[PDB]
Amino acid sequence: KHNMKAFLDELKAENIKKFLYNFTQIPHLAGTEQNFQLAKQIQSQWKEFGLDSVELAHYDVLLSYPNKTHPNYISIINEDGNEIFNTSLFEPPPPGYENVSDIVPPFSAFSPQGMPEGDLVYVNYARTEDFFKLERDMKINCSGKIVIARYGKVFRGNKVKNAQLAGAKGVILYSDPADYFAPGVKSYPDGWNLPGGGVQRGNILNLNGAGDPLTPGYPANEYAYRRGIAEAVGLPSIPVHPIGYYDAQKLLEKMGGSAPPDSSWRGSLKVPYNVGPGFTGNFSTQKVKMHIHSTNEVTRIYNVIGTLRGAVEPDRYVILGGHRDSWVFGGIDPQSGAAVVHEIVRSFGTLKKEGWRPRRTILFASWDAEEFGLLGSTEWAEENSRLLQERGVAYINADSSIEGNYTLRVDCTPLMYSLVHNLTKELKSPDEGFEGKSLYESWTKKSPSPEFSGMPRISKLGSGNDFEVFFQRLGIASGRARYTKNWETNKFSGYPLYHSVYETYELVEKFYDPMFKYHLTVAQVRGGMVFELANSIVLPFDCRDYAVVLRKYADKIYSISMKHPQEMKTYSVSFDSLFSAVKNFTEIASKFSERLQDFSNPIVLRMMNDQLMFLERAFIDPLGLPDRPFYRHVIYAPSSHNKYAGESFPGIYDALFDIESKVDPSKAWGEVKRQIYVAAFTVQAAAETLSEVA
Amino acid sequence: KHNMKAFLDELKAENIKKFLYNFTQIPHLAGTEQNFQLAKQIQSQWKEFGLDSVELAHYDVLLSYPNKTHPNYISIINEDGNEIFNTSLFEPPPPGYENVSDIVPPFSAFSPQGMPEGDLVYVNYARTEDFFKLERDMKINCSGKIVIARYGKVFRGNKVKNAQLAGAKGVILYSDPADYFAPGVKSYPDGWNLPGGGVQRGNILNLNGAGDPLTPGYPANEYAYRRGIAEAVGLPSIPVHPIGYYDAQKLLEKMGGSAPPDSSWRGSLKVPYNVGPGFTGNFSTQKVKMHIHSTNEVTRIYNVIGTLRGAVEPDRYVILGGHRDSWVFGGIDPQSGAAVVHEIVRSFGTLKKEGWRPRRTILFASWDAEEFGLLGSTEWAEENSRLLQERGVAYINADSSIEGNYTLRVDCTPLMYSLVHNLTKELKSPDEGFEGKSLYESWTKKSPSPEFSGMPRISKLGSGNDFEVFFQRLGIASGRARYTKNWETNKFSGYPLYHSVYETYELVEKFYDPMFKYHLTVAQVRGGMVFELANSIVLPFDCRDYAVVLRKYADKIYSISMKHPQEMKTYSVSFDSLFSAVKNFTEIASKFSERLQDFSNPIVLRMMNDQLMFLERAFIDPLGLPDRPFYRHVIYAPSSHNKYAGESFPGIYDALFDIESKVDPSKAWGEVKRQIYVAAFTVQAAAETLSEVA
Numbered sequence A, B: 001k002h003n004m005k006a007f008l009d010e011l012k013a014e015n016i017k018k019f020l021y022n023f024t025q026i027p028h029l030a031g032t033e034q035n036f037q038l039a040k041q042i043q044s045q046w047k048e049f050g051l052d053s054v055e056l057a058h059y060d061v062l063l064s065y066p067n068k069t070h071p072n073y074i075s076i077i078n079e080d081g082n083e084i085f086n087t088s089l090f091e092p093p094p095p096g097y098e099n100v101s102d103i104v105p106p107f108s109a110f111s112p113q114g115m116p117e118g119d120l121v122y123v124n125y126a127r128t129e130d131f132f133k134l135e136r137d138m139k140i141n142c143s144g145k146i147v148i149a150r151y152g153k154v155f156r157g158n159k160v161k162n163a164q165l166a167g168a169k170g171v172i173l174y175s176d177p178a179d180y181f182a183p184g185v186k187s188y189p190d191g192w193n194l195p196g197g198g199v200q201r202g203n204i205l206n207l208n209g210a211g212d213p214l215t216p217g218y219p220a221n222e223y224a225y226r227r228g229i230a231e232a233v234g235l236p237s238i239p240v241h242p243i244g245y246y247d248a249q250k251l252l253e254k255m256g257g258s259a260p261p262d263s264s265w266r267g268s269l270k271v272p273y274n275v276g277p278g279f280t281g282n283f284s285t286q287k288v289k290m291h292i293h294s295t296n297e298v299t300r301i302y303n304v305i306g307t308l309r310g311a312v313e314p315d316r317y318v319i320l321g322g323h324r325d326s327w328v329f330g331g332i333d334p335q336s337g338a339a340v341v342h343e344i345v346r347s348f349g350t351l352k353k354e355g356w357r358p359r360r361t362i363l364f365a366s367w368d369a370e371e372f373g374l375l376g377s378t379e380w381a382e383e384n385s386r387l388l389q390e391r392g393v394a395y396i397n398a399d400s401s402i403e404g405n406y407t408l409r410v411d412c413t414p415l416m417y418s419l420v421h422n423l424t425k426e427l428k429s430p431d432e433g434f435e436g437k438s439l440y441e442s443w444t445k446k447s448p449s450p451e452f453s454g455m456p457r458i459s460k461l462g463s464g465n466d467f468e469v470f471f472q473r474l475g476i477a478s479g480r481a482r483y484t485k486n487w488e489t490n491k492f493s494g495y496p497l498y499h500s501v502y503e504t505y506e507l508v509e510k511f512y513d514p515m516f517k518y519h520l521t522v523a524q525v526r527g528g529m530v531f532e533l534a535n536s537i538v539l540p541f542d543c544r545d546y547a548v549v550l551r552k553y554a555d556k557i558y559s560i561s562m563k564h565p566q567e568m569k570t571y572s573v574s575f576d577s578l579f580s581a582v583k584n585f586t587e588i589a590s591k592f593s594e595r596l597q598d599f600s601n602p603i604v605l606r607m608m609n610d611q612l613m614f615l616e617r618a619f620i621d622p623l624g625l626p627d628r629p630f631y632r633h634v635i636y637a638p639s640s641h642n643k644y645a646g647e648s649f650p651g652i653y654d655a656l657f658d659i660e661s662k663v664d665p666s667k668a669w670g671e672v673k674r675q676i677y678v679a680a681f682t683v684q685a686a687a688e689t690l691s692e693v694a
């Protein structure tokens, strides 16, 4: 038979291993020839695997690269302008790669050029609360200082935005062993820890969903009108550069001024972690000097788009997408995901060659320039937004399949909770000690839901990956799953070798998943999700799961407001409309579920499938969120303090955030009230899409 | 049988006459008790007629009314502050109505309060080109002057906006006999001309599609957050008041300063039509003083929404809507349309009682507060936008059925051209001298297309009626039809008794349509359109008609640009992308038409019906037009100089308008280029919705 089991059984760990090896022998940096060649290879193989059509969709977008003949570095400079210490010009290459060409040296993509010199201030993780502590409690002023911050906890672009608004004239990012060196494990190549010479590349944009900085709202095609660089979206105004902890130690060890306010500011280096500004007495006339010479350049990028036409509903799209571009070799990010997608295409193609077609159309994507701000997925979605708006069922992301080997990690819309629970109950656990047990059983045991007994944790969607345009801008039901570590507070920090030259095929094969059983398990979850979405007669969404979370989020935002009871009294701030809307949604969704079960009629079915498909669509506000026109979902948005984290009722959340510090409380509370109205209205409007249609 | 003929034959002139009489015995001003009572009557009758459900949808919106105990008027004031002449406090009531209560005196709705005194400047129709002539050619400065303008040619709100930006401190609108008194016809009550004491009420907002001034983007429901009046949308900043031509004559006769620049500035009054500023030597110390005391007040309004559930596609909506609120009796505007809607509901209900149901759902609407800025339709559409976005097939408007008795006047999307041509060929002409000939034949003869032989004129959609939110904001295929006059250059001016107390049932019965044959003909066109849209198996839209007009519009906008060849050379301004897109649209639409003809499969049918329904949707840009976020259609928008007129490629048009006067030509031409890109992209994207789906 041609059923989900046939599909799943065709998937092979061995094939995933072969493809991972194949995708990770050379770097595949966006906008380079090596990545175009890999695009063409994938396009060819997907055709061979049996897809109906496979095309490259290209765009010309703003990318950023170091100057090959004028390298970036940081110095300590003495009284006389002698550079007495220089940071490294490249990461020592790993064994057997010391002759590989075209390894991009560590840099912060989209940094402006500059050579600022000044005194250092240490800002911990450069989070909003870190800057509050500095400025409000410690009375330290960052204006005209070079800030140094440890990577971790939040997206690096948020750190740079926070530094810029504190008046910093430059930012130095570094990897502290506290966040990037697990106790009792060896440095690469002998284990999975970050060596002192290792450095994390990554972009530092604040795009808020815009895509290519030069063409917000429209695809960066051949005739596109581009903004001038001065009007570009999201570019940092101060130079930024990343370094390893050997180099960081040299910059931190001399630091003077104030002591760290408490232990949560101290990393693992043998230094005081003094905040500054500047160095201790003896070195007080030494400064830090950055040298940044990178250039932003409009460059062609290439997405691969494969189509497997649906047999019954060809005009309904289920999309499996993930990126292909890497900083260097991409042994985990993204090739552990790309290899999984490749094996899923192969398996679907095997069924198709035997005469099977899915019910709905399945689109497969290999996105480009993900590392430079989700550029490829965003531009494609801008080009095809009308088709996606009216036909998009669901989007399943497929970046890194592993970031650990401990348990499953799933983030998705509530609409997919039941699908995930059901599928994971049908799949075998790969975990030691859970042999013959379901994936659902190991996951729930290792990652328990904070709200429910005998249920697994499923997290919210924010941004920092290619689902963002589909979910936050267009309102298409989205999900993602991967294997992860135990390390709770390291959730948003990355595994240790993240975005370093050490992230190789050998890293994965030796230390992460020698048998490729975790990869296989993730291929089963991602592929099985796509299978059910593309093939189930009734779409596998349960609107009642949205009703349950909406109540939890309404309780939560109410509880935040209720920290300010006097203001709620003064300004008559009521959440009654929001709770009414959530109650209504719960009642209507219950009735709709009854009809979905109680309803041979393909019109009533598709009518009902359309109500299910457009339910996520209904949470979109066409006016967008305040000053973030491309984040249009009213229930979720990327956190304004951390792009990686999803925030619920973001418009009300941001209206409430730090509100006790606002100069005009009347105005600030009026805005909270406006956001409550928008939220209550959108919840009610979404509810009403599930009512009987006439 | 139950077919279109059964429906059409059930419609009766006699019934339309009875309903018109019934709706026009007392005023039905929005937000008054008399209009709420009429709402409830209609709700009752629609239920009795057989509709499945009929509900009132209420909102609380900003309305405007004179102060009953502090009347509005204008004076000529002498040196000593004696008011030597006062304009009228009310229009002399017509025969037999001289004891009717609750006739609102003439006023300009949403005028601010004030008592400005100053010198007059006469500004012709206060159009953009009139102000150009004054300021640029005649060097007359309106700053701190009271402007007097004749009604006609453009929407009155455009006149007020133009006056405000010329620095006027007040505006006096009047009805000139040149525009409102047809040669050889008697004044009301003895003919259809405007008496010297008659005055045209009307709102003077510049809402640009926002709806209720206080709640742009969201329905004005019970819990709505409202903007403060100072942040309200579209309110005029200077007092405004309308007067008749007896009063106007008194204000104009003393005018001095410069002579009218030419004859197109001279009306029909026995006065010089001097521009001013101020009065001739003898009266040079006399001033004009306005006294405006009207108040803006949040007030409840009521839409009636009737549903006739579809038998096969209940989740597809065809909407027939028109307003119920009038300035006074509304004998033409809107009751000649409302009576037609009432008879259409009755006829559909007769079929339904005999067991028939249309294929798709038909929604019938009696909108409130249309006269105060399309408030009722807009608020309802804001509340239901998700349902309309995903389910709305078409909207047919139904305001005044007659504004003359000469021929048909149709404005609609190109998608409906074929439907209208076909339907009008099947209907009998009501015209004298065309007995036994088709409506198509009389219409084409009397209103020939400027572009095609043996085709009738069909005009573009702008705004100034309740289709605006559906078409310009939401992108739902819209149309309208009515009977009209010959008077070409009076197209946007109104028939003479427009918005005056003289617009009565007797006006219509005696002078316009004694036999109600023109009303019947319009009921047949509107009802027949609804019938075909709600019942045809394949939606009756022809995408090839859009391809033809897109080429005409692209030729037109190119021709405007080509007045500036040196600039197009300097700035490399190419329309090639736009023509490419139009060519592509033409090719794809041709192929889609072939498939639509070449395709027993209900999925392929509905897939194809969905491609037809979402085609109008595809011309929507979610970012809207520049500084007009609620006008989102890229091919059409209300003219920025005249809300009543549709403009094609409005974004490029406005970028080009008066461009030779821009201070930074580089910037101005860069914007033209940006708009060409947006237009080319949107045309191509719309084209691609008609491609094979996978």
Ligand SMILES: *[C@@H]1O[C@H](CO)[C@@H](O[C@@H]2O[C@H](CO)[C@@H](O[C@@H]3O[C@H](CO)[C@@H](O)[C@H](O[C@H]4O[C@H](CO)[C@@H](O)[C@H](O)[C@@H]4O)[C@@H]3O)[C@H](O)[C@H]2NC(C)=O)[C@H](O)[C@H]1NC(C)=O
Pocket: A577, A578, A580, A581, A584, A680, A681, A684, B222
């Ligand atoms: C959740 O669903 C329910 C429907 O089950 C929905 O209930 C509706 O609530 C509105 C707003 O409260 C009700 O509005 C009232 O409507 C009546 C006419 O039906 C009016 O007369 C009321 O106005 C008077 O009273 C107000 C309150 O004191 C005054 O401010 C006002 O000046 C008037 O005196 C009022 O508009 C509506 O009737 C119900 N509909 C029902 C029960 O069918 C509720 O709104 C939904 N929640 C959300 C957030 O949408």
Ligand SMILES: *[C@@H]1O[C@H](CO)[C@@H](O[C@@H]2O[C@H](CO)[C@@H](O[C@@H]3O[C@H](CO)[C@@H](O)[C@H](O[C@H]4O[C@H](CO)[C@@H](O)[C@H](O)[C@@H]4O)[C@@H]3O)[C@H](O)[C@H]2NC(C)=O)[C@H](O)[C@H]1NC(C)=O
Pocket: A222, B577, B578, B580, B581, B584, B680, B681, B684
């Ligand atoms: C109307 O429909 C047609 C499809 O029939 C569509 O044609 C497409 O036009 C684009 C833009 O011109 C073509 O883009 C080219 O794509 C090739 C790869 O296929 C590139 O190598 C080209 O780039 C080179 O040449 C450029 C021009 O000199 C240079 O600027 C650039 O630096 C490169 O050297 C270029 O991107 C595309 O191939 C066709 N597609 C076809 C024929 O299938 C057209 O765009 C549609 N109209 C609109 C307005 O969308």
Ligand SMILES: *[C@@H]1O[C@H](CO)[C@@H](O[C@@H]2O[C@H](CO)[C@@H](O)[C@H](O)[C@H]2NC(C)=O)[C@H](O)[C@H]1NC(C)=O
Pocket: A021, A022, A023, A025, A040, A041, A044, A045
């Ligand atoms: C990755 O696998 C691909 C596909 O097997 C390899 O590309 C093929 O290599 C052979 C030998 O050079 C060529 O003849 C084919 O034309 C290629 N096929 C393609 C591109 O579809 C490629 O060599 C592998 N890369 C690595 C590093 O192992």
Ligand SMILES: *[C@@H]1O[C@H](CO)[C@@H](O[C@@H]2O[C@H](CO)[C@@H](O)[C@H](O)[C@H]2NC(C)=O)[C@H](O)[C@H]1NC(C)=O
Pocket: A075, A081, A082, A083, A084, A085, A086
């Ligand atoms: C850090 O690098 C800088 C730049 O290469 C070195 O300073 C340069 O040294 C050369 C050779 O002595 C001089 O000719 C240049 O004028 C210097 N350029 C400067 C100051 O920018 C410096 O020696 C290096 N420092 C260390 C400790 O290795």
Ligand SMILES: *[C@@H]1O[C@H](CO)[C@@H](O[C@@H]2O[C@H](CO)[C@@H](O)[C@H](O)[C@H]2NC(C)=O)[C@H](O)[C@H]1NC(C)=O
Pocket: A418, A419, A422, A540, A541, A542, A597
């Ligand atoms: C997850 O699986 C459960 C258990 O099978 C599904 O819930 C059942 O659905 C069937 C089929 O309609 C109903 O008749 C049962 O009453 C349901 N059992 C329950 C609610 O416990 C559920 O639909 C699946 N979820 C999906 C497919 O999204």
Ligand SMILES: *[C@@H]1O[C@H](CO)[C@@H](O[C@@H]2O[C@H](CO)[C@@H](O)[C@H](O)[C@H]2NC(C)=O)[C@H](O)[C@H]1NC(C)=O
Pocket: B021, B022, B023, B025, B040, B041, B044, B045
């Ligand atoms: C307009 O027609 C309506 C409906 O025929 C009339 O309202 C009815 O009048 C009778 C007599 O007063 C009442 O008993 C009914 O309850 C009314 N029916 C309704 C409101 O549905 C109304 O009188 C007519 N108005 C005029 C001016 O002729």
Ligand SMILES: *[C@@H]1O[C@H](CO)[C@@H](O[C@@H]2O[C@H](CO)[C@@H](O)[C@H](O)[C@H]2NC(C)=O)[C@H](O)[C@H]1NC(C)=O
Pocket: B075, B081, B082, B083, B084, B085, B086
């Ligand atoms: C125009 O109307 C004004 C206002 O009613 C008249 O002026 C008022 O006249 C009364 C009675 O003489 C005075 O007591 C008021 O003080 C006047 N109020 C003003 C100047 O605002 C005026 O007489 C009328 N003019 C004409 C020509 O009828």
Ligand SMILES: *[C@@H]1O[C@H](CO)[C@@H](O[C@@H]2O[C@H](CO)[C@@H](O)[C@H](O)[C@H]2NC(C)=O)[C@H](O)[C@H]1NC(C)=O
Pocket: B418, B419, B422, B540, B541, B542, B597
């Ligand atoms: C308007 O009527 C014309 C003439 O009947 C329709 O065009 C015909 O449609 C039929 C039915 O599919 C085709 O087989 C003919 O070839 C068409 N004749 C032509 C193009 O001259 C047209 O479809 C109608 N338009 C509507 C219903 O929107």
Ligand SMILES: N[C@@H](CCP(=O)(O)C[C@@H](CCC(=O)O)C(=O)O)C(=O)O
Pocket: A202, A203, A333, A370, A371, A372, A373, A374, A399, A400, A463, A464, A465, A494, A643, A644
């Ligand atoms: N761990 C994260 C990051 C994966 P990523 O591919 O590395 C994304 C990349 C760009 C994100 C952006 O620009 O928004 C970055 O975070 O630097 C995840 O799994 O989702």
Ligand SMILES: N[C@@H](CCP(=O)(O)C[C@@H](CCC(=O)O)C(=O)O)C(=O)O
Pocket: B202, B203, B333, B370, B371, B372, B373, B374, B399, B400, B463, B464, B465, B494, B643, B644
């Ligand atoms: N002749 C016009 C006007 C009919 P209307 O009902 O009178 C509309 C009303 C308000 C329009 C607005 O606010 O946008 C007005 O123009 O004053 C037509 O038929 O379409």
Ligand SMILES: *[C@@H]1O[C@H](CO)[C@@H](O)[C@H](O)[C@H]1NC(C)=O
Pocket: A067, A068, A069, A070, A295
């Ligand atoms: C790279 O290095 C030097 C620095 O000016 C110069 O030769 C060249 O312009 C640079 N390339 C750039 C800026 O892209």
Ligand SMILES: *[C@@H]1O[C@H](CO)[C@@H](O)[C@H](O)[C@H]1NC(C)=O
Pocket: A141, A142, A143
């Ligand atoms: C921070 O330092 C700069 C130094 O010139 C100054 O302009 C700024 O106002 C300072 N802010 C505070 C609050 O200390």
Ligand SMILES: *[C@@H]1O[C@H](CO)[C@@H](O)[C@H](O)[C@H]1NC(C)=O
Pocket: A192, A404, A405, A485, A511, A512
């Ligand atoms: C894989 O799992 C084993 C067993 O707990 C563990 O010791 C090892 O650290 C894991 N590998 C990684 C990279 O987490």
Ligand SMILES: *[C@@H]1O[C@H](CO)[C@@H](O)[C@H](O)[C@H]1NC(C)=O
Pocket: B067, B068, B069, B070, B295
């Ligand atoms: C109407 O007339 C007078 C003018 O002030 C006053 O008695 C009353 O306030 C006015 N009503 C208003 C302003 O609504």
Ligand SMILES: *[C@@H]1O[C@H](CO)[C@@H](O)[C@H](O)[C@H]1NC(C)=O
Pocket: B141, B142, B143
């Ligand atoms: C128009 O008149 C006012 C009078 O003060 C003045 O401010 C304004 O600049 C004048 N404009 C021109 C161009 O005459």
Ligand SMILES: *[C@@H]1O[C@H](CO)[C@@H](O)[C@H](O)[C@H]1NC(C)=O
Pocket: B192, B404, B405, B485, B511, B512
């Ligand atoms: C109706 O038509 C007749 C015949 O042309 C004409 O004389 C009369 O003016 C028309 N009525 C109106 C109101 O236009």
